[PDB]
């Protein structure tokens, strides 16, 4: 059995549309929905968790004054169910703020480390869905990466664009993501940054 954390960006900008295109919040939702129900209807033994960053409410274990703010744990590590599908499909809504995605990554890493004790898991994975239009601090980044390697936590990013009308912060986020992914697995790591469109296509074949 594997443990997967869906780290979804629900910031204000996630609801912004361009030229009538589907907002990245909707795109990320479709990908998450298609993945979840595929796990549910397949009787998969993989347990899923969902962390949200950008929520107007703060609800995580590491939350403190100016520490991991606007990050909420929507679903703890357990098997996916029809309730989760209903929640992701109609309950989860975008927030009014922009949270630090690296703080969210840490929360996801802490959620796995704490809720995986003793239990035997074959793979630990974190999937991030975001438009990268949120500011973030790089404090102790090298420690985050080392713990990802030490804990054997693979990583994937899903964006509304390819790596090439982007904002300043969005361009800054791209480089940080590519930096992280290259340090984890080099070229093979860079190929683990997908678009919502591409991911939706792959998740519709067997």
């Amino acid at each position: 059995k594997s443990a997967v954390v869906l780290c979804m960006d629900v910031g204000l900008a996630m609801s912004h549309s361009n030229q009538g295109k589907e907002s990245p919040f909707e795109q990320a939702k479709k990908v998450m929905m298609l993945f979840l129900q595929r796990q549910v209807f397949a009787e998969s033994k993989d347990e899923i968790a969902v962390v949200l960053y950008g929520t107007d409410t703060t609800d995580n274990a590491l939350a403190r004054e100016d520490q991991y703010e606007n990050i909420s744990v929507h679903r703890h590590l357990m098997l996916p169910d029809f309730d989760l599908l209903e929640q992701i499909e109609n309950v989860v809504e975008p927030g009014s703020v922009q949270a630090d995605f690296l703080d969210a990554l840490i929360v996801s890493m802490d959620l796995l480390q704490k809720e995986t004790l003793g239990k035997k898991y074959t793979r630990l994975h974190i999937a991030v869905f975001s438009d990268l239009s949120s500011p973030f601090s790089v404090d102790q980044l090298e420690v985050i990466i080392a713990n990802l390697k030490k804990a054997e936590i693979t990583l994937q990013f899903f964006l509304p664009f390819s790596v090439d009308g982007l904002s300043d912060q969005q361009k800054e986020g791209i480089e940080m993501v590519r930096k992280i992914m290259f340090s984890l697995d080099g070229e093979e790591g860079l190929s683990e940054v997908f678009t919502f469109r591409d991911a939706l296509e792959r998740l519709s074949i067997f």
Partner: peptide
């Protein structure tokens, strides 16, 4: 393949 496509 790996991750969500695993």
């Amino acid at each position: 393949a790996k991750g969500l496509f695993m």
